[PDB]
Amino acid sequence: SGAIYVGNYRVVNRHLATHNDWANLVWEDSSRDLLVSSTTAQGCDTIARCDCQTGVYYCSSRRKHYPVSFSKPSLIFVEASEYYPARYQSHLMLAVGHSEPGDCGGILRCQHGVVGIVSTGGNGLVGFADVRDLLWLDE
Ligand SMILES: CSc1ccccc1CC(=O)N1CCC[C@](O)(C(N)=O)C1
Ligand SMILES: [Zn+2]
């Protein structure tokens, strides 16, 4: 679990979105596993606007943050699950690191701010859904 709070927006993994998220929907994209809903309070997370490939992520299954090198956002094949059929998930970045299903939503940050959230994993790898291209999150 976990979300990004920026301005009047809440960013979560689409497969973990609540009824409230869907009732206050701004934008969603199944291919990116992202959903953005509106909030009544002001969010203070800073979104990074950069091409960093190093950062730190929060891993709830270890209660620890880990430093990682990660790939550039791209289309990566993701195994079928209870939420989606087998497909290419876009805007995904992989890193060598520990992750478990309940880890989705953990933030990845670089020195410039929030980069994305944990969205996939398996076999000593962890995948992050990028949010750096969503320029509208700041306006
Ligand atoms: C951190 S998630 C994880 C980690 C280790 C092992 C397995 C997983 C599960 C995982 O990859 N998904 C199942 C739920 C849907 C999913 O989030 C997606 N974006 O399609 C993919
Ligand atoms: Zn950066």
Swiss-Prot record:
Zn(2+) 1 binds at C50, C52, C110, H112. Coiled coil: none annotated. Homodimer. This is Protease 2A. Transmembrane segments: none annotated. Cysteine protease that cleaves viral polyprotein and specific host proteins. It is responsible for the autocatalytic cleavage between the P1 and P2 regions, which is the first cleavage occurring in the polyprotein. Also cleaves the host translation initiation factor EIF4G1, in order to shut down the capped cellular mRNA translation. Inhibits the host nucleus-cytoplasm protein and RNA trafficking by cleaving host members of the nuclear pores. Counteracts stress granule formation probably by antagonizing its assembly or promoting its dissassembly. The active site is at H15, D33, C104.
